[PDB]
Design a protein around this ligand. Structure first.
Ligand SMILES: Nc1ncnc2c1ncn2[C@@H]1O[C@H](COP(=O)(O)OP(=O)(O)OP(=O)(O)O)[C@@H](O)[C@H]1O
Length: 447
């Protein structure tokens, strides 16, 4: 914990260690999923928040992903009774009717509950039924026969979902596939009730028809954040704040601490953010201002604090900003924002928009106010300076490369996302837009 360049922070870390030496330990903030601690000094005063640091693809795996696995009867998209891996039991609203159909299919009295092996057995039968539907059908067989194996799986998938008659209705789409007009078929297929009803699944299936690859199935749920590097995201947010002089992130650094109160299986690395006093959740003050609106001078100061927050979150592409984890202090500044809890930023890619990770401040009426001339003149000279942006990237490299799991390609991905954010923010500030308009702009990267 040498902080040669920041003696003020060093002395805070020294008070922390001295309190631990005399038994005063960090306490979990919330007793349950404790990964956060209030660190105290010798006088038992809170001074900081410490946060310690072969798949086989085929029609079976494809449909497992699209249909999931339930062991008890549930309702589906439409609402019909279903179990296992997308096995439709009956159209009837009668739950007893469903349990009856189930008991026939399984060969015992299930009462609407089966095992994994029974689920998998029904699954196999259903895939076989689908292939039978295909081969017995005059419009489908010729198409099926003409396709490679991966595209054949896409077609089985559709038949499994919609039934043989349903898929046979895609007369022109089917002919297009058979002529190997992949792009045209893909376009035509998206213009369907099928797609509109289940657009995420349809999109995966159509991508498979279009490419003859498993690419729409390969990376699901990988997310957009590098794993187990929240402590560096916390430190990185403060680094960005400081370089732009935003002054809304409390000082946050990577430190080592040892404490009995930590969860061990020996110093632990993690982020240490200075504790700020007298703040409430933004949502609390937003509620209070409905009855007691801010006088113009303070409304103006608040909106310039807000603009700083927006600039921070946009540049680091925060994926986790709610209106509970930016804080506001209100009784030099008359009103002040603290941007805390910055552990889920610097993604290595823009989100896929199946999960949008929106900024919750974007829902606020305030977000539709254009950026002030004040903020524009302060920030534009930095972010439009390519030298400044390079130096920022170099600063973040020096911080991020310290982690055992660091990977150069992934970091350069993080930076191409960040540089993209900065480019869009530059244009938005030049265009005199609002935070709300800013978040509309399609995402770009700088390669
Ligand atoms: N720097 C700070 N100063 C004052 N209070 C803080 C600070 N950082 C966090 N807190 C408070 O501590 C509580 C939890 O903080 P934080 O969210 O950062 O930890 P967490 O365990 O990740 O929780 P979450 O899961 O809520 O993100 C919140 O009430 C927050 O307001």
């Amino acid at each position: 914990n040498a902080f040669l360049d920041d003696p003020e922070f060093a002395d805070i870390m020294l008070r922390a260690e001295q309190a631990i030496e005399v038994g005063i330990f960090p306490e979990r903030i919330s007793q349950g999923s404790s990964g956060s601690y209030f660190v105290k000094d010798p006088k038992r005063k809170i001074i900081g928040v410490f946060k310690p640091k072969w798949t086989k693809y085929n029609i079976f795996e494809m449909l497992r992903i699209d249909e999931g696995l339930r062991l008890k009867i549930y309702k589906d998209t439409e609402g019909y009774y279903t179990i296992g891996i997308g096995h439709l039991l009956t159209k009837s609203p009668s739950l007893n009717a469903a349990k009856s159909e189930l008991d026939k299919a399984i060969g015992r009295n299930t009462n609407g509950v089966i095992t994994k092996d029974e689920a998998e057995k029904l699954f196999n039968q259903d895939v076989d039924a689908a292939v039978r539907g295909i081969l017995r059908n005059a419009k489908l067989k010729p198409v099926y026969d003409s396709l490679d194996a991966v595209r054949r799986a896409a077609l089985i998938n559709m038949v499994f979902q919609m039934g043989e008659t349903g898929v046979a209705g895609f007369t022109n789409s089917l002919r297009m596939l058979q002529q190997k007009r992949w792009d045209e078929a893909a376009v035509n297929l998206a213009k369907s009730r099928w797609y509109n009803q289940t657009p995420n699944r349809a999109k995966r299936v159509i991508t498979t028809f279009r490419t003859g690859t498993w690419d729409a199935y390969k990376n699901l749920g990988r997310g957009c954040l590098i794993p187990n590097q929240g402590y560096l995201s916390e430190a990185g947010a403060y680094l960005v704040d400081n370089k732009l002089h935003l002054s809304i992130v409390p000082k946050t650094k990577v430190v080592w601490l040892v404490s009995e109160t930590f969860n061990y299986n020996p110093p632990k690395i993690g982020s240490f953010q200075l504790f700020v006093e007298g703040y409430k959740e933004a949502e609390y003050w937003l509620r209070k201002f409905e009855a007691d609106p801010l006088p113009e001078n303070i409304r103006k100061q608040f909106q310039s604090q807000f603009e700083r927050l927006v600039i921070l979150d946009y540049i680091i592409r925060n994926t986790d900003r709610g209106n509970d984890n930016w804080l506001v202090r209100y009784e030099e500044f008359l009103i002040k924002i603290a941007a805390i809890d910055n552990g889920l930023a610097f993604p290595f890619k823009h989100p896929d928009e199946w999960r949008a990770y929106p900024f919750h401040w974007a829902w606020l009426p305030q977000a539709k106010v254009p950026f002030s001339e004040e903020i524009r003149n302060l920030i534009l000279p930095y972010i439009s300076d390519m030298n400044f942006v390079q130096d920022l990237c170099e600063d973040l490299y020096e911080l991020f490369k310290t982690d055992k799991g660091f990977d150069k390609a992934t970091f350069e991905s993080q930076m191409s996302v960040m540089r993209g954010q900065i480019l869009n923010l530059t244009q938005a500030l030049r265009d005199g837009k609002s935070p709300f308009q800013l978040v509309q702009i399609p995402c770009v990267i700088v390669e």
